[PDB]
Design an enzyme around this catalytic site. Sequence first.
Site, PDB file in Angstrom:
ATOM      1  N   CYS B  51       0.768  -1.249   0.000  1.00 13.90           N
ATOM      2  CA  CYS B  51       0.000   0.000   0.000  1.00 13.90           C
ATOM      3  C   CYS B  51       0.800   1.300   0.000  1.00 13.90           C
ATOM      4  O   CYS B  51       0.950   1.941  -1.044  1.00 13.90           O
ATOM      5  CB  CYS B  51      -0.944   0.027   1.217  1.00 13.90           C
ATOM      6  SG  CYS B  51      -2.246  -1.244   1.280  1.00 13.90           S
ATOM      7  N   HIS B 112      -3.491   7.695   3.068  1.00 15.39           N
ATOM      8  CA  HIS B 112      -2.373   6.945   3.653  1.00 15.39           C
ATOM      9  C   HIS B 112      -0.996   7.526   3.319  1.00 15.39           C
ATOM     10  O   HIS B 112       0.022   6.805   3.324  1.00 15.39           O
ATOM     11  CB  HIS B 112      -2.419   5.466   3.251  1.00 15.39           C
ATOM     12  CG  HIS B 112      -1.759   4.556   4.237  1.00 15.39           C
ATOM     13  ND1 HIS B 112      -1.463   3.239   3.957  1.00 15.39           N
ATOM     14  CD2 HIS B 112      -1.374   4.763   5.516  1.00 15.39           C
ATOM     15  CE1 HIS B 112      -0.910   2.676   5.020  1.00 15.39           C
ATOM     16  NE2 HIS B 112      -0.846   3.580   5.980  1.00 15.39           N
ATOM     17  N   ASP B 269      -3.141  -1.108  -6.554  1.00 11.74           N
ATOM     18  CA  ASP B 269      -1.933  -0.537  -5.965  1.00 11.74           C
ATOM     19  C   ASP B 269      -0.872  -1.583  -5.647  1.00 11.74           C
ATOM     20  O   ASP B 269       0.294  -1.213  -5.447  1.00 11.74           O
ATOM     21  CB  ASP B 269      -2.249   0.233  -4.695  1.00 11.74           C
ATOM     22  CG  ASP B 269      -2.669  -0.662  -3.559  1.00 11.74           C
ATOM     23  OD1 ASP B 269      -3.228  -1.767  -3.795  1.00 11.74           O
ATOM     24  OD2 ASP B 269      -2.456  -0.245  -2.410  1.00 11.74           O
TER      25      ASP B 269
HETATM   26 CA    CA Z   1      -2.906  -2.203  -1.170  1.00  8.42          CA
END
Ligand code: CA
Lengths: 464, 464
Positions: B51, B112, B269
């Site tokens: 991520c 994030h 991602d």
């Molecule tokens: Ca991810």
Amino acid sequence: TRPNILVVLCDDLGYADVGFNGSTDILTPELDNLAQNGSIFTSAYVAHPFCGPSRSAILTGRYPHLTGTAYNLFHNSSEDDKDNMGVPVEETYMSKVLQNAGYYTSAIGKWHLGAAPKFHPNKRGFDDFYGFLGGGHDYFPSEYQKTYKAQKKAGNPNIRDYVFPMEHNGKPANETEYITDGFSREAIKNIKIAAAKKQPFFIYLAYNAPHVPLQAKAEDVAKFAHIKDKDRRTYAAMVYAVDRGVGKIVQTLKETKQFDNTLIVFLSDNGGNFNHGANNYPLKGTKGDTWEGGYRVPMFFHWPKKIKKDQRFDFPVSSLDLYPTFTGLAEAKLPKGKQLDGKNIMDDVLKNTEPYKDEMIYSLRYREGYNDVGARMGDWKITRMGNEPWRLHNITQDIGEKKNLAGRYPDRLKEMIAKTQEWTKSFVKPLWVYSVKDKELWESGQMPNYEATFEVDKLVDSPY
Amino acid sequence: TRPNILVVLCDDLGYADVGFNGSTDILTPELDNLAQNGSIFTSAYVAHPFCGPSRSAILTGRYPHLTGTAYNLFHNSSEDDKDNMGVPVEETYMSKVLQNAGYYTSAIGKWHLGAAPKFHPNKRGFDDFYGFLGGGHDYFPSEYQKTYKAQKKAGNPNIRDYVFPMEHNGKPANETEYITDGFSREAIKNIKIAAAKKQPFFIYLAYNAPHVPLQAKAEDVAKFAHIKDKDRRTYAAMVYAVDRGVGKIVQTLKETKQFDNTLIVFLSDNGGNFNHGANNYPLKGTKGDTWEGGYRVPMFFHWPKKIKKDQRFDFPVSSLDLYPTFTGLAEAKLPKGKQLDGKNIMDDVLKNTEPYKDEMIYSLRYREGYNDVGARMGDWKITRMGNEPWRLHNITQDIGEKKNLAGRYPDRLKEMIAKTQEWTKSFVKPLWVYSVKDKELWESGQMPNYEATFEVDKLVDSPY
Ligand SMILES: [Ca+2]
Ligand SMILES: [Br-]
Ligand SMILES: [Br-]
Ligand SMILES: [Br-]
Ligand SMILES: [Br-]
Ligand SMILES: [Br-]
Ligand SMILES: [Br-]
Ligand SMILES: [Ca+2]
Ligand SMILES: [Cl-]
Ligand SMILES: [Cl-]
Ligand SMILES: [Cl-]
Ligand SMILES: [Cl-]
Ligand SMILES: [Cl-]
Ligand SMILES: [Cl-]
Ligand SMILES: [Cl-]
Ligand SMILES: [Cl-]
Ligand SMILES: [Cl-]
Ligand SMILES: [Cl-]
Ligand SMILES: [Cl-]
Ligand SMILES: [Cl-]
Ligand SMILES: [Cl-]
Ligand SMILES: [Cl-]
């Protein structure tokens, strides 16, 4: 009258690669029929997730971490006794114990417990040996004998042991057929010999199939011609050839009237390598891992005189149990001072009783600078793979090890980690390692570092 | 003349989990129709196998090892600008570049990249932000709002950010539906805003689906009721809700007559987590690995004005290419001194030419004491996983990385390792790490030890 004992041990057979254990594409009718007429073990474990140490454990009855044999011997390992490239001779094999109790003993196929004379099968309790001393072998004598001669014709000083001539008690074997078929042929011969001697037999039939190289007979491939992936097709043909031979072995047992009172044990020596045709479904991982896929194997017991048909034994067992189970059935006395890590499970199997209630079945695999660990007690398993955070699984509900429960039940996690750490306090140093990297890490102290292995909170705590 | 740009970024979508990329059980008709009418990328890579760093790379156009952001931010990370828990503010996002070139910019869903105000989307080039600042979130507002309120009223000091209220430009979002549907509605709303402003838009649609928790609407689950595994079924329903929203977005683009001059980019991602419902077939491995399964993702470009229908682009591309490709399309000038690791590939896509001829696409993932590596050039890839010996694959012939050719072509292997090692010579120190264990290893120098990572011979040579 004491039973004959036949151990059929395959090499790198995947968890889902026999019919009785869930295979949809590999046909093993002979193995399935034996399994349906005996007890199938749904949670059977070997003592290490790859070849040499698992075999060391089966024959010594001890974890390889206690005998110094937790790394594989390199191919073409030393054949001079002065180099101790083999399982310590002081660790008495169950074959010798059975031999000293009057059994006719025979080892066929793969050894991998030492290529020097003091480690030879005929010195380790086997009246008869037919096979090869190393870790693997090419399957077709027409191909590998030619290669061997040619490589001698160039004076090659490092010929691969995969092409060496095989032996029969130290003499050239002069094999002429696909070696899976030859090992089956030799098993039948040794059953006929023991029958003629009116002597109970112990046969260690260590097929190298379906271990690489993937090589199969055209007649066997044809039974799987609809499988599009070539590796899977060839692997299936290899497993099928083992099944053909078990069917021939079974016929011989019936003709010699040894079938009813023979304990046939079939298992794999470690999990399948899913890079080379194997499938370990529904388990996670591959040969070498401390995921279930590395060291949980198919296994059945077949013994018509005592084991009921259509049995499923769902309690966890170990390949370490074979040593005390066999010596028990043989009414043999153990050598003075012999230490064993398993137990006799024959009574547990007959009465469906739990042999490891509140006890541990372990695995620890050395990596390049850390250790992979697995440990099961009851329905619970802890796992560390890749030096990642510890995992806790209810292996009975989550056979694929997908849901980490370490956070929900940290007491269980730390109790299981505590017992596993204590187990490693009894380990000895490896007598040999596998790579130059290994030797450096153990010499510098970077390995084994069991203390770092059993850390828990720091792998998960944030420093902020 | 300049096109609109819509980035649809899913979270943890598996390689085989959309129709156009081989899924047989998950239905994605809307995504498939766009893909069939544009260019499918069969060798698309993100810059990191999980991520946070992957997302940092997408918006900065740089490998996270060069910006210091190769570890995830911990959940509930610091919200004070003083602690600098976020992507460096000096590393200009492509959103700001596009903003400074007259684009209406919008971010939706997951962020994030820092939860402190200096890292906020509205300070990083986004006119509008609708979503959450951390790494994940629960899907049903009726449930997480109730939990958040109860725990706020009880003065709970450790409320999980997965239940924090979402925000709209710093104010409460007051979400009322399944947030995937909520995110689609916001994309539609922002498309109409850009149309009313008569401005080209750049929309960063960062769905958190199908990332855990596996939560799905019953009506969507009903469409996959024949899927027996509960986790696979819910996951399928989560991917489906993304597909439904893409179809509503497409309808809006046609009504506003923006469809033909919009470049829609769809990708994940990172690789799917196969413990939580994802399927990466035919790739090996899972989210976080440097096997193909960790960072090779589905991707298509769809742009009717210029990109031909039914195209398949087979040369390797990187998500780092989106930054110079988008700014190139925006005719924007780059900030003075801005460093980029990717390249504009729109011309290569239109003329079907190789963007990375004789050049490398990389991945390096930090582990607890060692590094996982992958590096591809052309048909060839090198892989190191779990600190095992190096592997060399022809990924065009061996997409599952099953056949190690490192012994057969040691010249190629060593030259690819040399180039990869030189790449690591430019890395910076991480601005933060993830666990306490991480910190100790970095302070003692046990990490990163790139030198040991690129050893080759000692990992395979026998010491005897
Ligand atoms: Ca991810
Ligand atoms: Br012995
Ligand atoms: Br021979
Ligand atoms: Br009989
Ligand atoms: Br392999
Ligand atoms: Br910025
Ligand atoms: Br909300
Ligand atoms: Ca094996
Ligand atoms: Cl040779
Ligand atoms: Cl592997
Ligand atoms: Cl009976
Ligand atoms: Cl507990
Ligand atoms: Cl040593
Ligand atoms: Cl700790
Ligand atoms: Cl709320
Ligand atoms: Cl909470
Ligand atoms: Cl249009
Ligand atoms: Cl996971
Ligand atoms: Cl995993
Ligand atoms: Cl080469
Ligand atoms: Cl640091
Ligand atoms: Cl080296």
